[PDB]
Write an enzyme that holds these catalytic residues in place. Structure first.
Site, PDB file in Angstrom:
ATOM      1  N   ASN A  42       5.233   0.273  11.360  1.00 16.35           N
ATOM      2  CA  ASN A  42       4.644   0.634  10.075  1.00 16.35           C
ATOM      3  C   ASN A  42       4.252   2.106  10.034  1.00 16.35           C
ATOM      4  O   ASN A  42       3.564   2.596  10.936  1.00 16.35           O
ATOM      5  CB  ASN A  42       3.413  -0.249   9.849  1.00 16.35           C
ATOM      6  CG  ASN A  42       2.888  -0.195   8.429  1.00 16.35           C
ATOM      7  OD1 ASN A  42       3.199   0.716   7.665  1.00 16.35           O
ATOM      8  ND2 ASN A  42       2.067  -1.180   8.072  1.00 16.35           N
ATOM      9  N   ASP A  76       0.804  -1.216   0.000  1.00 19.36           N
ATOM     10  CA  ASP A  76       0.000   0.000   0.000  1.00 19.36           C
ATOM     11  C   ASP A  76       0.840   1.270   0.000  1.00 19.36           C
ATOM     12  O   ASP A  76       0.273   2.367   0.061  1.00 19.36           O
ATOM     13  CB  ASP A  76      -0.951   0.006   1.203  1.00 19.36           C
ATOM     14  CG  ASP A  76      -0.221   0.099   2.536  1.00 19.36           C
ATOM     15  OD1 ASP A  76       1.031   0.166   2.539  1.00 19.36           O
ATOM     16  OD2 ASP A  76      -0.911   0.109   3.583  1.00 19.36           O
ATOM     17  N   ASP A  85       7.925  -0.259   6.688  1.00 16.34           N
ATOM     18  CA  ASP A  85       8.209  -0.779   8.023  1.00 16.34           C
ATOM     19  C   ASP A  85       9.649  -0.458   8.409  1.00 16.34           C
ATOM     20  O   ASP A  85      10.567  -0.651   7.605  1.00 16.34           O
ATOM     21  CB  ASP A  85       8.019  -2.301   8.100  1.00 16.34           C
ATOM     22  CG  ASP A  85       6.574  -2.745   7.899  1.00 16.34           C
ATOM     23  OD1 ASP A  85       5.645  -1.912   8.006  1.00 16.34           O
ATOM     24  OD2 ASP A  85       6.384  -3.957   7.636  1.00 16.34           O
TER      25      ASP A  85
END
Ligand SMILES: [Cl-]
Ligand SMILES: [Cl-]
Ligand SMILES: [Cl-]
Ligand SMILES: [Cl-]
Ligand SMILES: [Cl-]
Ligand code: NA
Length: 129
Positions: free
Chosen positions: A59, A48, A52
Site C-alpha cells: 500500500n 482513501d 496497492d
C-alpha cells in the site's frame, strides 16, 4: 508476470521467506494467491486514494512512493512501480519490513480472511523446493 504456484513458492524460498518471522512458505503463497492471483502487475485503488501494488498488494499509504498519495509515507524507500516487476525481489524485501512491524501477516487482509487458520501447507504440496 503471472507466476505458477510452485514457481512462486520456489522464488519466495530463494529470497528467504520460508519461515521468515515464523511464517511458513505456504502462508506467503496463499497470501499472494488471494491478493493478486499471482500477478505481479496487479493494482487496486483504495477508498482513501492510496493504491496497492504487485504480487503482495503493498500500500502506497505507508510503504512506497507513487507521487499521488498526499501525506503518505515511503517506508520501504522505493517507487511503487518497482513492486510490479517480474523480479519479485523488491516486493519480498518490502514485505519483510511489513511483517516485522508488530502485526505479522495480519497486515494482509486477504491472508487474515482466507489463509489464517487453514492448512496452508496445501499451497506448496507437490512442489520441488
Ligand atoms: Cl492457483
Ligand atoms: Cl507451509
Ligand atoms: Cl505521494
Ligand atoms: Cl528473482
Ligand atoms: Cl507474528
Ligand atoms: Na507513499
Amino acid at each position: 508476470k503471472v507466476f505458477g504456484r510452485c514457481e512462486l513458492a520456489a522464488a519466495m524460498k530463494r529470497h528467504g521467506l520460508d519461515n521468515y518471522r515464523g511464517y511458513s512458505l505456504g502462508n506467503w503463497v496463499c497470501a499472494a494467491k488471494f491478493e493478486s492471483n499471482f500477478n505481479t502487475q496487479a493494482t487496486n485503488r483504495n477508498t482513501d486514494g492510496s493504491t496497492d501494488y504487485g504480487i503482495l498488494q503493498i500500500n502506497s499509504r505507508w510503504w512506497c512512493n507513487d507521487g499521488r498519495t498526499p501525506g503518505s509515507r515511503n517506508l520501504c524507500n522505493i517507487p511503487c512501480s518497482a513492486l510490479l516487476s517480474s523480479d519479485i525481489t523488491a516486493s519480498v524485501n518490502c514485505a519483510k519490513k511489513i511483517v516485522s512491524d508488530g502485526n505479522g501477516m495480519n497486515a494482509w487482509v486477504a491472508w487474515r480472511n482466507r489463509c489464517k487458520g487453514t492448512d496452508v501447507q496445501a499451497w506448496i504440496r507437490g512442489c520441488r523446493l
